[PDB]
Amino acid sequence: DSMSQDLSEALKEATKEVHIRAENSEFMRNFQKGQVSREGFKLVMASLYHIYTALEEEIERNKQNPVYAPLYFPEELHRRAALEQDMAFWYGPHWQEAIPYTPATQHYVKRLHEVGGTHPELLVAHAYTRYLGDLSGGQVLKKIAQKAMALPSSGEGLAFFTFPSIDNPTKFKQLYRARMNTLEMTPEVKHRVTEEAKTAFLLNIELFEELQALLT
Numbered sequence: 001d002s003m004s005q006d007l008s009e010a011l012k013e014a015t016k017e018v019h020i021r022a023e024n025s026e027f028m029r030n031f032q033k034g035q036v037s038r039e040g041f042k043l044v045m046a047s048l049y050h051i052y053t054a055l056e057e058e059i060e061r062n063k064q065n066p067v068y069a070p071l072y073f074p075e076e077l078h079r080r081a082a083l084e085q086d087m088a089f090w091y092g093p094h095w096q097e098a099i100p101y102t103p104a105t106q107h108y109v110k111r112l113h114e115v116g117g118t119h120p121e122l123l124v125a126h127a128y129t130r131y132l133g134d135l136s137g138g139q140v141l142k143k144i145a146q147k148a149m150a151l152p153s154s155g156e157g158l159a160f161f162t163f164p165s166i167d168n169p170t171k172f173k174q175l176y177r178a179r180m181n182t183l184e185m186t187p188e189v190k191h192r193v194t195e196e197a198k199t200a201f202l203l204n205i206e207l208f209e210e211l212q213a214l215l216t
């Protein structure tokens with residue numbers, strides 16, 4: 001197998017194909033072209049709320065585990081608190097009972113717990129997939145959402161897309177990739193981590209196809 005490369009390199013080469021598929025999914029495609037409504041935006045953000053909540057809960061559970069510990073950046077990355085602000089903004093005071101919890105979202109959340117509870121050595125695959133993506137297309141989707149729905153530059157309703165503790169996401173991404181290469185990595189784990197990364201992308205693709213359908 002390809003163990004002659006660093007985990008960050010293996011992950012990038014392993015997910016580049018499905019990434020193109022995920023990037024050109026119907027829901028994302030629309031969002032990219034400015035075509036994004038309040039109804040849909042609220043659907044995906046509520047979904048991300050449940051997802052990041054599960055991911056970050058598993059991160060806390062395994063924060064001391066060396067298979068993940070070097071990547072424990074709650075202050076800089078975690079989105080749960082940010083998404084809670086966003087839910088209050090979009091759904092109001094009682095968002096805990098108003099926000100949806102779709103099947104595709106539940107599916108994603110279920111795999112997150114399985115990994116965090118049973119296969120924690122794979123958890124890095126899920127943080128990698130979501131966090132780095134946020135740091136890459138984060139400012140892009142944000143500027144689009146603002147132009148489309150008239151969200152003020154002050155950021156209310158888009159806290160999720162804002163990283164106040166990260167000055168340069170590009171530099172941080174570089175740090176995160178390098179830190180990923182310091183994890184205990186056997187040919188067995190690296191092999192499985194890259195596969196789980198694909199699964200994460202697929203889970204994201206399945207969420208989008210589901211939301212797109214709900215909207216149409």
Ligand SMILES: [Fe+3]
Pocket residue numbers: 019133136137
């Ligand atoms: Fe991306």
